[PDB]
Amino acid sequence: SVPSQKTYQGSYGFRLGFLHSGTAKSVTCTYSPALNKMFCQLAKTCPVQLWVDSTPPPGTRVRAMAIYKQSQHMTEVVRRCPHHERCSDSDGLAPPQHLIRVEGNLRVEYLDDRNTFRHSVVVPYEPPEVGSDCTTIHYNYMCNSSCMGGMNRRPILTIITLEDSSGNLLGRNSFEVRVCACPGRDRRTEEENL
Ligand SMILES: [Zn+2]
Numbered sequence: 001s002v003p004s005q006k007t008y009q010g011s012y013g014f015r016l017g018f019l020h021s022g023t024a025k026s027v028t029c030t031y032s033p034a035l036n037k038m039f040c041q042l043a044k045t046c047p048v049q050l051w052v053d054s055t056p057p058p059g060t061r062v063r064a065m066a067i068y069k070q071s072q073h074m075t076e077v078v079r080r081c082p083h084h085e086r087c088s089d090s091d092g093l094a095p096p097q098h099l100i101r102v103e104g105n106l107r108v109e110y111l112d113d114r115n116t117f118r119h120s121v122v123v124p125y126e127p128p129e130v131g132s133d134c135t136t137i138h139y140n141y142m143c144n145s146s147c148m149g150g151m152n153r154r155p156i157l158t159i160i161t162l163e164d165s166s167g168n169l170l171g172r173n174s175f176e177v178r179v180c181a182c183p184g185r186d187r188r189t190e191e192e193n194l
Contacts, residue, residue, distance in 0.1 A: 002074045005174050013053025014171030023184035030183050037176040039183035049134040059165030060125035069155040080143045081150030101140045141179040
């Protein structure tokens with residue numbers, strides 16, 4: 001089937017935020033508010049912020065999953081291409097087929113859905129620090145959008161879900177993603193078409 005991608009702030013006022021990085025040649029990750037699209041480099045740190053109005057109960061978890069944006073590819077599971085799947089970039093935690101990984105969190109958990117076969121990565125939800133207003137999760141995309149045999153130029157969306165310790169849905173948000181070599185340039189160019 002196909003995972004829901006409907007925005008749902010829920011009772012905790014769950015929202016996503018991103019760094020305002022700009023489009024200079026040096027940027028490794030930059031978000032476009034106009035396109036609700038993230039442009040980032042392969043395996044590089046991609047900061048995604050979790051903003052809430054109320055602190056979720058203990059045991060709450062955060063899940064990330066990718067799905068193809070185009071309706072004619074939506075049913076196809078998003079996974080790494082043969083090359084990167086076989087490439088030796090393993091961190092010892094993430095399965096080799098998974099596109100999305102989380103770095104700097106030893107409590108990260110990966111899942112191959114037994115029924116839908118969709119891949120996803122989840123971490124415990126942690127309240128914002130003192131003086132801090134949001135929680136930051138560092139994601140890494142282990143395949144380029146252009147990868148032959150993988151996404152193969154097909155656009156993807158990343159769906160972030162907030163769930164309780166039992167898996168019940170608490171909140172949902174999403175954004176488009178493009179993994180490329182020059183995020184800044186690519187973002188600036190796609191926004192010109194506006
Ligand atoms: Zn690849």
